[PDB]
Amino acid sequence: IKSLFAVIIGGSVGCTLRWLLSTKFNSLFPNLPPGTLVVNLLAGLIIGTALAYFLRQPHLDPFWKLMITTGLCGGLSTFSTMSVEVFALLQAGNYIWALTSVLVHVIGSLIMTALGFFIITILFA
Amino acid sequence: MIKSLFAVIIGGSVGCTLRWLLSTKFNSLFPNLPPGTLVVNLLAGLIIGTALAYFLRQPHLDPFWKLMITTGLCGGLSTFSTMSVEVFALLQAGNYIWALTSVLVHVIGSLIMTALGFFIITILF
Amino acid sequence: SVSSVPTKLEVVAATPTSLLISWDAPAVTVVHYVITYGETGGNSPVQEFTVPGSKSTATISGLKPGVDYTITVYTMYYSYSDLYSYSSPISINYRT
Amino acid sequence: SVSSVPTKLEVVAATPTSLLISWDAPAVTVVHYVITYGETGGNSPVQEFTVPGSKSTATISGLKPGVDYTITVYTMYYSYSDLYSYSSPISINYRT
Ligand SMILES: CCCCCCCCCCO[C@@H]1O[C@H](CO)[C@@H](O[C@H]2O[C@H](CO)[C@@H](O)[C@H](O)[C@H]2O)[C@H](O)[C@H]1O
Ligand SMILES: CCCCCCCCCCO[C@@H]1O[C@H](CO)[C@@H](O[C@H]2O[C@H](CO)[C@@H](O)[C@H](O)[C@H]2O)[C@H](O)[C@H]1O
Ligand SMILES: CCCCCCCCCCO[C@@H]1O[C@H](CO)[C@@H](O[C@H]2O[C@H](CO)[C@@H](O)[C@H](O)[C@H]2O)[C@H](O)[C@H]1O
Ligand SMILES: [F-]
Ligand SMILES: [F-]
Ligand SMILES: [F-]
Ligand code: NA
């Protein structure tokens, strides 16, 4: 039950952030909606920093770890919204931006995970 | 914006909760490509695809239900960040073949399930 | 707040039995455009066909000379909130 | 419920000043193993080094002949709940 509240509180803040950022920015550049990209990049960054940080604080309450990762990052990032954007582009015959979206989302999210991990790793060293 | 916020939170919380339950139950069974995280991305891909075809045919659906299913449920259920750390960990573990396989199976799998969701409903109607 | 309806629908070239139409794409992911045409005098079947989202022109053939046609174009488009939906039409009258 | 601690830690080959150790990997994504070693008797300093997650063997060098060493291995691993964390150790005694 305490773990469930972590997922819901964190998840709700994540989902809400995604919704606000997406409705505000997605329509600015429809070939690669930047609101959906930014939330995936930002979640990639937070989970990377969480990765490095939680390793060094092994006595942190599982509540906070679960609220940040499964909750916030899990709620903030989205695979389904990325997929329909890509699916729509494929159906529109816009194959170059369908590929670019997939690559920029995947490559971008892993880069931001690395940046999050190594910035904190370099700070502690 | 308050009624829209409850749609995102109610849908998002059910999605995040489902992801959490399915992930803790199944991810540890096959750690090279955690199946709980895959299943939720595949399932969100399926739901958003069926939503795609269905909402097109019901243009007078309340924006509340569309927002609860897409930004809420599918957005909360799917995850890009959890997919990224799994892949990042594999890269750091020197397991490059499963890092690539995870990325491909998640992306290709999620688009296939979006197509299946869209075309099954399109063929029914 | 971004319009999904095409703009500047016009007949760019014409023969007595055909029309080449063009329009400006709206700033949204258009999957396909749907072109409709029929005789303005409300006593004829309206016909429709699609064109891909990449194309912003279409040819209408098999028309009768000296007849007024109502021609409309709308989009089947992707947006964030609505997923796949249909835009309102933009509409013109043209006499062959 | 899946253990992240290695199993069957053993010395597979030995010289007077070195040990080749091996272990069975736990069924989790191990990022690196941490090998520790120190003289079983009392208060010599325990030393550690890491080995990549792909490897399931390590060489310990610079040991003294005829001395009892306590050797432990633990993992730095990824799991769903805990992210990066450290396992409990598995431990053996060996006399060069
Ligand atoms: C890597 C994983 C892939 C997973 C599978 C996803 C498949 C997505 C594409 C399927 O949708 C089709 O896409 C065609 C191409 O856009 C469309 O053709 C449309 O556009 C063409 C122009 O490119 C015309 O020739 C066609 O007649 C016209 O139907 C067609 O309507 C649409 O149903
Ligand atoms: C994401 C996973 C699936 C990826 C699909 C496979 C990878 C395809 C690589 C790019 O393909 C090219 O894309 C151009 C740009 O889209 C097309 O342009 C041509 O064809 C288009 C057809 O839709 C026209 O709209 C263009 O004007 C014309 O230049 C061209 O034919 C096509 O070979
Ligand atoms: C597709 C776009 C991707 C963009 C982002 C990619 C970010 C990936 C970060 C990888 O992190 C490194 O991975 C190495 C490789 O696993 C590790 O080496 C470790 O493991 C190796 C395996 O043999 C050893 O050779 C090294 O000495 C040892 O430090 C190293 O520690 C770790 O920091
Ligand atoms: F998905
Ligand atoms: F992400
Ligand atoms: F993954
Ligand atoms: Na999500």
Side-chain angles (χ1 to χ4, degrees):
Chain A
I1 302 297
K2 197 181 183 190
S3 291
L4 193 65
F5 277 124
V7 175
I8 290 168
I9 292 163
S12 296
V13 171
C15 294
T16 296
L17 267 174
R18 176 165 38 76
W19 175 58
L20 290 171
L21 288 169
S22 297
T23 53
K24 196 170 174 63
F25 298 138
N26 281 358
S27 67
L28 271 43
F29 188 81
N31 285 305
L32 174 38
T36 302
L37 182 55
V38 161
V39 300
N40 279 355
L41 294 184
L42 186 61
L45 187 65
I46 295 166
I47 199 83
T49 59
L51 198 64
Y53 182 65
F54 297 160
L55 178 57
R56 293 155 175 77
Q57 310 302 323
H59 293 351
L60 273 192
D61 203 318
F63 180 83
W64 294 112
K65 295 160 71 180
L66 198 58
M67 199 189 89
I68 292 161
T69 62
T70 295
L72 176 60
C73 290
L76 180 55
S77 76
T78 175
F79 217 106
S80 58
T81 312
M82 195 277 298
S83 291
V84 276
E85 284 163 356
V86 170
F87 184 81
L89 292 168
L90 290 180
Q91 294 216 306
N94 193 346
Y95 301 124
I96 197 72
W97 281 106
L99 184 61
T100 303
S101 291
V102 164
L103 294 176
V104 170
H105 271 271
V106 170
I107 302 289
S109 181
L110 291 170
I111 285 170
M112 295 304 279
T113 301
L115 273 169
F117 179 77
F118 290 118
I119 286 162
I120 299 301
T121 299
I122 289 164
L123 258 45
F124 276 100
Chain B
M1 295 287 172
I2 301 297
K3 195 187 183 178
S4 291
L5 192 65
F6 277 123
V8 175
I9 290 168
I10 292 164
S13 296
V14 170
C16 294
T17 296
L18 267 173
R19 177 164 38 77
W20 175 58
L21 290 171
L22 288 169
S23 296
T24 53
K25 196 171 173 62
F26 298 138
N27 281 359
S28 66
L29 271 41
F30 188 81
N32 285 306
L33 174 37
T37 302
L38 181 55
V39 160
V40 300
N41 280 354
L42 294 184
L43 187 61
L46 187 65
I47 295 165
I48 200 84
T50 60
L52 199 65
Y54 183 66
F55 297 161
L56 178 58
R57 294 154 228 286
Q58 310 302 323
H60 289 356
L61 272 194
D62 201 318
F64 180 83
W65 295 113
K66 294 159 71 169
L67 197 58
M68 199 184 94
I69 292 160
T70 61
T71 296
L73 176 59
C74 289
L77 180 55
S78 76
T79 176
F80 217 106
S81 58
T82 312
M83 195 277 297
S84 291
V85 275
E86 284 163 355
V87 169
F88 184 81
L90 292 168
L91 290 180
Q92 294 216 305
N95 194 347
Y96 303 123
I97 196 72
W98 281 106
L100 184 60
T101 303
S102 292
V103 163
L104 294 175
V105 169
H106 271 271
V107 171
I108 302 290
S110 182
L111 291 170
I112 285 170
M113 295 304 278
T114 301
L116 273 169
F118 179 76
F119 289 118
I120 287 162
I121 299 301
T122 299
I123 289 165
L124 258 44
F125 281 81
Chain C
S1 55
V2 178
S3 182
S4 61
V5 186
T7 53
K8 296 185 188 161
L9 174 58
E10 61 188 356
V11 174
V12 308
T15 73
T17 65
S18 70
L19 306 172
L20 176 52
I21 52 165
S22 86
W23 55 87
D24 285 358
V28 296
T29 301
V30 176
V31 178
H32 60 81
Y33 298 92
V34 179
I35 296 79
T36 81
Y37 63 101
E39 300 187 20
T40 310
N43 192 32
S44 171
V46 171
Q47 273 171 296
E48 322 182 22
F49 61 100
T50 63
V51 300
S54 38
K55 305 306 95 165
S56 69
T57 70
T59 302
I60 297 167
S61 321
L63 305 183
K64 294 165 171 160
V67 173
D68 247 289
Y69 286 90
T70 297
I71 302 163
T72 88
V73 179
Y74 65 95
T75 61
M76 202 284 277
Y77 70 102
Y78 172 85
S79 68
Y80 176 63
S81 281
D82 311 329
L83 269 58
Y84 284 172
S85 74
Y86 297 107
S87 75
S88 287
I90 182 164
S91 197
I92 58 166
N93 294 320
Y94 192 85
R95 180 178 280 282
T96 52
Chain D
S1 55
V2 179
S3 182
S4 60
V5 186
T7 53
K8 297 186 184 185
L9 175 57
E10 62 184 340
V11 174
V12 307
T15 74
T17 65
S18 71
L19 306 170
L20 175 53
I21 51 166
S22 88
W23 55 88
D24 285 355
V28 297
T29 301
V30 175
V31 180
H32 64 272
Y33 298 92
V34 179
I35 295 78
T36 82
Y37 63 101
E39 302 186 344
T40 311
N43 194 32
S44 168
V46 171
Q47 276 170 299
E48 47 171 318
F49 61 100
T50 62
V51 160
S54 37
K55 304 307 94 165
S56 68
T57 70
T59 304
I60 299 162
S61 314
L63 305 182
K64 295 314 305 293
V67 173
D68 307 71
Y69 286 91
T70 298
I71 303 164
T72 89
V73 179
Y74 65 95
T75 61
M76 201 283 275
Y77 69 102
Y78 172 86
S79 67
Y80 176 63
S81 281
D82 311 328
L83 268 62
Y84 284 173
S85 75
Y86 297 106
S87 76
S88 288
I90 182 166
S91 197
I92 58 165
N93 294 319
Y94 193 84
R95 181 178 176 77
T96 53

